[PDB]
């Protein structure tokens, strides 16, 4: 019944600050040392900091020394991570993790045994913005041996995420929505495609339903076949 729930994650401007929280329950918080570990999307795990059970001692990764501060309030079973002078490379999912008890009820163990699901931190100065949705129409150039590919380009939005469904959710088979990609403009972009029988292009309409809740914008783009040559 061990629980670790992080919060505080969000978008922060480069150079500004953000404080993360981690509410613990299901175990005796004041007896365990606690850690913060981060991980950039699709990247490796990187230890950030650790603090003793009584808050008397802390240790930090060289990349965050002098910028981050780990602390705790045992009276409320809460762990904190004060992040200052944030940089683009600090973007990542931040996990608060528990480490096992020590032989002597005093030293560190480094035996991280329970992890929270994390809180996302994004460092950018980009303004919230809904996406522009462009059709990736099926044509001779996107149709091979009885199969036609079509999709939607969900471009220039911030921040993540966007959700894409096809034909109001009725079309799920053959659908591939790719991981968003960060453009040099600071805005995200992603593509959602689907392959269907060429024989259906004249009897079935295709529409991608895009939703960007941070900007509360909805866009339904019709994707129609094109002639070629």
């Amino acid at each position: 019944q061990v629980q670790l729930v992080e919060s505080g994650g969000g978008v922060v401007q480069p150079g500004r600050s953000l404080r993360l929280s981690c509410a613990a329950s299901g175990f005796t918080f004041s007896n365990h040392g606690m850690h913060w570990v981060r991980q950039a999307p699709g990247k490796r795990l990187e230890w950030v900091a650790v603090i003793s059970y009584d808050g008397r001692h802390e240790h930090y990764a060289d990349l965050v020394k002098g910028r981050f501060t780990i602390s705790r309030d045992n009276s409320k079973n809460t762990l904190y991570l004060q992040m200052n002078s944030l940089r683009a490379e600090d973007r990542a999912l931040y996990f608060c993790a528990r480490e096992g008890l020590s032989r002597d009820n005093s030293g560190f163990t480094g035996l991280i045994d329970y992890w929270g699901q994390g809180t996302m931190v994004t460092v950018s100065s980009a303004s919230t913005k809904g996406p522009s949705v462009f059709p990736l129409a099926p044509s001779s150039k996107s149709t091979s041996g009885g199969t036609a590919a079509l999709g939607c380009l969900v471009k220039d939005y911030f921040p993540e995420p966007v959700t894409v469904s096809w034909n109001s959710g009725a079309l799920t088979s053959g659908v591939h929505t790719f991981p968003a990609v960060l453009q040099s403009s600071g805005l995200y972009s992603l593509s959602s495609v689907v392959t269907v029988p060429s024989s259906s292009l004249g009897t079935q309409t295709y529409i991608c339903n895009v939703n960007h809740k941070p900007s509360n914008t909805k866009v339904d783009k019709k994707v129609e076949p094109k002639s070629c040559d």
């Binding site: 795990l45 992890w115 059709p135 996107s142 380009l153 591939h176 990609v181 453009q183 495609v193």
Partner: protein, 214 residues
């Protein structure tokens, strides 16, 4: 700091087989080695600690061994739920606490060359930027490369690619590459080609179109 090097970087196996993952340290850490399992959109899960001790609920098919600088995570009789990323972590000499770079255990299936499709910019998008998309669909293995050429000039720094997670049903992957140009530059050239390199293809496959063709 203790550098942890896992090997191989990616393991391709199928249910019922045995997975052997190594973790080597730059210096001795005794038996202070931990193994984690991490599935996409999920936090790491403790599997084994102290090199060979399985955590509560972890099935006997998982076994850790080794000492000093060489450790091994062995998974006998692989099951569908075992396909994920594995990380080793040392607590022998810290701070800093260090992790391995991770090992991707994926499902092996027979090679499948990608179906290649190319999409010119939409008329709507043309009304100051032009995006050209190349889709590599349902292929295996995951390694795939896309090269862009405009009027036969190799393109550099103006494209981005993305890959899907391994399909749960057909065990394939899909990749999409986008070439972004200024409308001026797009109107400037004629031929747009997407060159694909994948082992399912004996030689690179080129997919192209002329501006205003479709």
């Amino acid at each position: 700091e203790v550098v942890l090097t896992q090997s191989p970087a990616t393991l391709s196996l199928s249910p019922g087989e045995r997975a052997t993952i190594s973790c080597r340290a730059s210096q001795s850490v005794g038996g202070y080695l931990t193994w984690y399992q991490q599935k996409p959109g999920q936090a790491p899960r403790l599997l084994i600690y102290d090199a060979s001790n399985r955590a509560t609920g972890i099935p006997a098919r998982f076994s850790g061994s080794g000492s000093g600088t060489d450790f091994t995570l062995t998974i006998s009789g692989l099951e569908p739920e075992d396909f994920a990323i594995y990380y080793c972590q040392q607590r022998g000499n810290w701070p800093p606490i260090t992790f391995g770079q991770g090992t991707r255990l994926e499902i092996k299936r027979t090679v499948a060359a990608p179906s290649v499709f190319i999409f010119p910019p939409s008329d709507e998008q043309l009304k100051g930027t032009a995006s050209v998309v190349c889709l590599l669909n349902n292929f295996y293995p995951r390694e795939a490369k896309v090269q862009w050429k405009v009027d036969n000039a190799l393109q550099s720094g103006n494209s981005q690619e993305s890959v899907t997670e391994q399909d749960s049903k057909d065990s394939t992957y899909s990749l999409s590459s986008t070439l972004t140009l200024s409308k001026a530059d797009y109107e400037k050239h004629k031929v747009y080609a997407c060159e694909v390199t994948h082992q399912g293809l004996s030689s690179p496959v080129t997919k192209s179109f002329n501006r205003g063709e479709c």
